[PDB]
């Protein structure tokens, strides 16, 4: 019920990613690696890059094995490309094991590495179905479970500070915990509620109802999951399908109407600032996402505060004002429950029982009047119909 | 053909430079001078060097004037040092005028002069902003325009042979034309299309779209001009910013995938050879660069063939094979539309109207199936956003 060695093993923030220390090769080469539930490749910088101060040097590892195969991962105006191989991998603040795992050695990239993120690679924690070049490239977690006795589960506690962390602060601050092979009860309060993993590719889930300050968004529930809904620690925002996004922004604007904000704010592009300590949290609504339960015709809900969906950012003038960006944005690839949502909760990726658990996080940001919540059950019918085909 | 006295006044090739004959001093001293749109100094060898068979002898010129100032010019590879002065300068196959111009007399150099290039100096045709030591040293063309009635424009037709030229052939062959003060209609076909000169320092332009065999490279257009894009007759290759180069090479490899080439070829280091006459031009893609037009929201494109981007080179075994080097390479200083690109086109440097014109060259190398092209217009929005800002 406690995994002391793994508690507080994460660093980072929602805007740039949460990462864990890993070692690759013999002798071990230490790297900081993005914890990414939204992808399935273990890919590390393996050549000089202006944003990297270290990278994987294959020629210095006696245990390096060349798979003699390339891998190309393009995004919309950007990419990563590399060379496949295998090597011995360990997680210093993880299970006391060493695994032989696939590694994509990144040789070229465009708009991939982030200046000041402090990470040099990515740990794709999702399933083989979405691994590149194809599903035959076993993901890291699959190798870890196959080669050791580590239980087939991991849990994430991502801790948003609630205020901007400068360069030195973010390197010194504890950003959360990745518990590998278990659940640590000190990381959450209340009960854990589980939603089924719909299909094993991304960590896909089904949203059955959406509320803004208890008011039903009242859309056909298939809209909420068009074309899928996923839990992604590697996405900053809560991202919503176009139609859902438009309806949600209209409702959030209506609820917060006592103050008017420029359109650039609602586009997640420009910041909004208030005098130190005067952020008007109470004018912004809570957002409730109802998820399919494990029991027939039953759902539960997770409730998010503006302390989660308003992302703290430093002002251009580095003033004493408290500034934020709107961390809800449009998607054309379905709902994405990103880092800003995960920061409210302790999230259990129970691969063994094909389900994801949510509980209120012991590190979520709130105020004296409202708290994030995980509650249930609720009677909900035809929930399978909310899934898109 | 309105400028017969200037037509065919160039010699040289893309690998070593195109040069024009000039005279300096009184009595005139003849020198061959690199035509360089990528720099702004008129600099000539003025002391013995192993690769020079002649140089400027200031002590023999009655019109020489010493400016009593030194100049130090380092490049990526190579550098030179000189002594500044002025003298009377003429272009025998040029306008029939004589002008007093600044001259940097090169007294010391390292990896600057090229063995067998046949040129003894450089004619920097770009703007004062990039002149050395600073912008107060008036460039040659500025002096020419100020002192005479020559219109503020020049045009270049660089003629690539399409095959290697030995030492004897390169000296006897016509390498192209530099028309000073005008546009000669015999040097091009079709229409001239103009792109704005973004800023007067280098001949800076803005590329708004890139295609490989009609397939959009699909990069943010700012990437194509990061940190600038220039037209440089003094650069051999088409040079592209790192990310653009990586994307272009991947696409060129994919288009030419029926034949595999070693990594050294794509690095522009090693040659590739085919049996005489069998170069598989058709497997290589055409490359289109769209440039900002003179009209709002309008662009045009220039299309080049592998006959431009594959530079003919003599085989190591001087065999009968047709050999080439890949003449596209990476840059950390922005896009450079070098000589191999300019060989496809007649290029008008319209300084008076702050614009550069392109038209299909009457001397471009092609095959029976494809030709280089200059076409337009194309509707293109937010082109100003393609320009880079520090
Ligand atoms: C909160 O997590 C992040 C914050 C900023 C950037 C990234 C990030 C950077 C580069 C690649 C990824 C990626 C592999 C690809 C991607 O687009 N997503 C959404 C993802 N989950 N992982 C993330 C993660
Ligand atoms: C096609 O033009 C050339 C081919 C080979 C070499 C040169 C050349 C040699 C020495 C200096 C220059 C220079 C003055 C400096 C430079 O690096 N570039 C790119 C330039 N435009 N002119 C060119 C020109």
Domain residue ranges in chain A: 18-150, 151-389
Look at strands A204-205 and A29-36 and give their pairing: unpaired
Does A110 reach chain B within 8 Å, measured CB to CB?
yes
Distance CA B345, CA B357 (A): 9
Contacts of B1 (CB under 8 A, 6+ apart): B7, B184, B185, B186
CA–CA separation, A156 vs A18, rounded Å? 10
Strand-pair partners of B12? B18
Beta carbons of A94 and A6 less than 8 angstroms apart: yes
**Six-digit token pair at A362?**
């012991």
* Token output for A289: 């996402």
| Cα separation, B343 vs A64, whole angstroms | 48
Cα B186 to ligand 1 centroid, rounded to whole Å: 56
The CATH code of domain A18-150 reads: 2.40.70.10
Q: Ligand nearest A202 Cα, by number?
A: 1
Could you give the CA distance from residue B85 to residue B216 in angstroms, rounded to a whole number? Answer: 50
Give the residues across from A323 on adjacent strands: A273, A313
Would you call A129 an interface residue with chain B, using a CB distance cutoff of 8 Å? no
Chosen CATH of A151-389 out of 2.40.70.10, 3.60.15.10, 3.30.200.20, 1.10.1740.10? 2.40.70.10
End-to-end CA distance of chain A: 38
Q: Most A CBs within 10 Å: which of B210, B215, B243, as the mutation test of the A interface?
A: B243
The number of helices, as runs of H, and strands, as runs of E, in chain A is 7, 26
CB atoms near residue A256 (< 10 Å): 17
Residues 243-272 of chain B whose Cβ lies under 8 A from any Cβ of chain A: 243, 246-247
Contacts of residue B257, Cβ cutoff 8 Å, sequence gap at least 6: none
**Helical segments of chain B, H only:** 140-147, 167-172, 242-255, 263-266, 306-309, 339-342
A275-302 in b/e form (b: 16+ CB < 10 A) is eeeebebeebbbbbbbbbbeeeeebbbb
Backbone CA torsion sign across A48, A54, A56, A58: positive
Q: Which of B260, B357, B279 lies closest to B323, judged by CA? A: B279
Which strands, in side-by-side order, build the sheet including A204-205?
Answer: A204-205, A229-231, A335-337, A238-241, A328-331
Q: What would the two tokens of residue B69 be?
A: 């100032």
**Residue of A7, A14, A360 whose CA lies nearest to A164:** A14
**In angstroms, rounded to a whole number, what is the distance separating the alpha carbons of residues B158 and A322?**
61
Inter-chain touch A77–B246, beta carbons under 8 Å: no
Q: C-alpha angle with apex B374: B369 to B377, nearest 5 degrees?
A: 125
User: CA of A111, closest CA in chain B: separation in Å?
Assistant: 10
**Per-residue buried b or exposed e for A188-224, using 16+ beta carbons within 10 Å of the residue's own CB:** beeebbbbbbbeebbbbbbbbbbbbeeeebebebebb
Which tokens belong to A3? 């995994």
* Resolution of the experimental structure, in angstroms: 1.7
Q: The tokens of A181 are what? A: 């092979």
Taking the mean position of all CA atoms in its chain, how far away is CA A159?
11
CA torsion through residues A121, A127, A130, A132, sign = positive
Put simply, the answer to whether B218 touches A110 (Cβ < 8 Å) is no
Q: Is B232 in the pocket of ligand 2 (CB under 6 A)?
A: yes
The two three-digit tokens of residue B270, written as one number: 């090693």
**What backbone torsions phi and psi does residue B47 show, to the nearest 5 degrees?**
-155, 155
Q: Is B65 exposed, middle or buried (0-12, 13-18, 19+ CB in 10 A)?
A: middle
Please name which of A264, A261, A210, A277 lies closest in space to residue A238, comparing C-alpha atoms. Answer: A210
CA A338, distance to chain mean position in Å, is 5
> How many CB pairs (< 8 A) connect A and B?
7
Q: How far, in Å, are A376, B159, B327 from residue B277 at the CA level?
A: 78, 20, 20
| Phi/psi of residue A344, nearest 5 degrees | -80, -15
Give the C-alpha separation, A200 to A127, whole Å. Answer: 6
Q: Which two three-digit tokens encode residue A10? A: 């994460």
The strand pairing partners of B170, in sequence order, are none
CA geometry: angle B363, B365, B369, nearest 5 deg: 125
3-state secondary structure of B42: strand
**Distance between CA atoms of A117 and A75, rounded to whole angstroms?**
19
Q: Helix, strand, or coil here: A124?
A: strand
Question: CB of B219 within 8 Å of any CB in chain A?
Answer: yes
Q: Which fold would CATH assign to domain B151-390? A: Cathepsin D, subunit A; domain 1 (2.40.70)
Burial of B361 (0-12, 13-18, 19+ CB in 10 A): buried
CA distances from B83 to B35, B54, B86 (A): 21, 18, 10
Q: How far apart are CA B312 and CA B16, in angstroms?
A: 12
Q: Which of A213, A241, A214, A236 lies closest to A226, judged by CA?
A: A241
Q: How many CB atoms neighbour CB A242 within 10 A? A: 12
Task: Say if the Cβ atoms of A77 and B220 lie within 8 Å.
Answer: yes
Structure tokens at B305: 């063939």
Structure tokens at A8: 């507080």
Give dist(CA A174, CA A13) in Å, integer.
10
Q: Give the Å distances, CA to CA, from B158 to A368, B3, B8, B341.
A: 76, 16, 10, 9
Q: How far is A122 from chain B (nearest CA, A)?
A: 21
Query: Within 13 Å of residue A131, how many CA atoms lie on the same side as its CB?
Result: 25
Distance, in Å, from the CA atom of B388 to the CA atom of B334, rounded to the nearest integer, reads 10
Say yes or no: do domains B18-150 and B151-390 share a fold.
Answer: yes
Q: Are A152 and A139 in contact (CB under 8 A)?
A: no
Residue found by looking up tokens 């393996």 in the block: A46
| Dihedral, CA of residue A161, residue A167, residue A172 and residue A173, to nearest 10 | 10
Phi-psi region of B265 (alpha: psi -120 to 50; beta: other; left: phi over 0): alpha
Q: How far is CA B338 from CA A301, B232, B309, in A?
A: 62, 5, 10
**Residue B252 to residue A119: CA distance in whole angstroms:** 33
b/e sequence B115-143, b meaning 16+ C-beta within 10 Å:
eebbbbbbbbbbbbebbbeeeebbbbbbb
Q: In A, which residues are within 8 Å of B219 by CB distance?
A: 77
Joined together, the tokens standing for residue B11 give 């010699």
Query: How far apart are the C-alpha atoms of B137 and A207, rounded to whole Å?
Result: 71
């Amino acid at each position: 019920g406690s995994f002391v060695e793994m508690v507080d093993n994460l660093r980072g923030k929602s805007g740039q990613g949460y990462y864990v220390e890993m070692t690759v090769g013999s002798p071990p080469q230490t790297l900081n690696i993005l914890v990414d539930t939204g992808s399935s490749n273990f890919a590390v910088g393996a050549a000089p890059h202006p944003f990297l101060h270290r990278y994987y040097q294959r020629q210095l590892s006696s245990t390096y094995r060349d798979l003699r195969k390339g891998v190309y991962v393009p995004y919309t105006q950007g990419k990563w490309e590399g060379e496949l191989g295998t090597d011995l991998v360990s997680i210093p603040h993880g299970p006391n094991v060493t695994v032989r795992a696939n590694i994509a050695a990144i040789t070229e990239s465009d708009k991939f590495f982030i200046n000041g993120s402090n990470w040099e690679g990515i740990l794709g924690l999702a399933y083989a179905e979405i691994a590149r070049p194809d599903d035959s490239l076993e993901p890291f977690f699959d190798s870890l479970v196959k080669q050791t006795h580590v239980p087939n589960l991991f849990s994430l506690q991502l801790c948003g500070a609630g205020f901007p962390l400068n360069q030195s602060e973010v390197l010194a601050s504890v950003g959360g915990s990745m518990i590998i092979g278990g659940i640590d009860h000190s990381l959450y309060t209340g009960s854990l509620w589980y939603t089924p993993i719909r299909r094993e590719w991304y960590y896909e889930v089904i949203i059955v109802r959406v509320e803004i300050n208890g008011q039903d968004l009242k859309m056909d529930c298939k809209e909420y999951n068009y074309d899928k809904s996923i839990v992604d620690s590697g996405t900053t925002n809560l991202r919503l399908p176009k139609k859902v996004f438009e309806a949600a922004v209209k409702s959030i604007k209506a609820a917060s109407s006592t103050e008017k904000f420029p359109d650039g704010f609602w586009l997640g592009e420009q910041l909004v600032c208030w005098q130190a300590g005067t952020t008007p949290w109470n004018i912004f609504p809570v957002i409730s996402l109802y998820l399919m339960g494990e029991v027939t015709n039953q759902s539960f809900r997770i409730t998010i505060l503006p302390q989660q969906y308003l992302r703290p950012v430093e002002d251009v003038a580095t003033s004493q004002d408290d500034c934020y960006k709107f961390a809800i944005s449009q998607s054309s690839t379905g709902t994405v429950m990103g880092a800003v949502i995960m920061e409210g909760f302790y999230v259990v990726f129970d691969r063994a029982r094909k389900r994801i658990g949510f509980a209120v996080s012991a590190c979520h940001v709130h105020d004296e009047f409202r708290t994030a919540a995980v509650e249930g059950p609720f009677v909900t019918l035809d929930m399978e119909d909310c899934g898109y085909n």
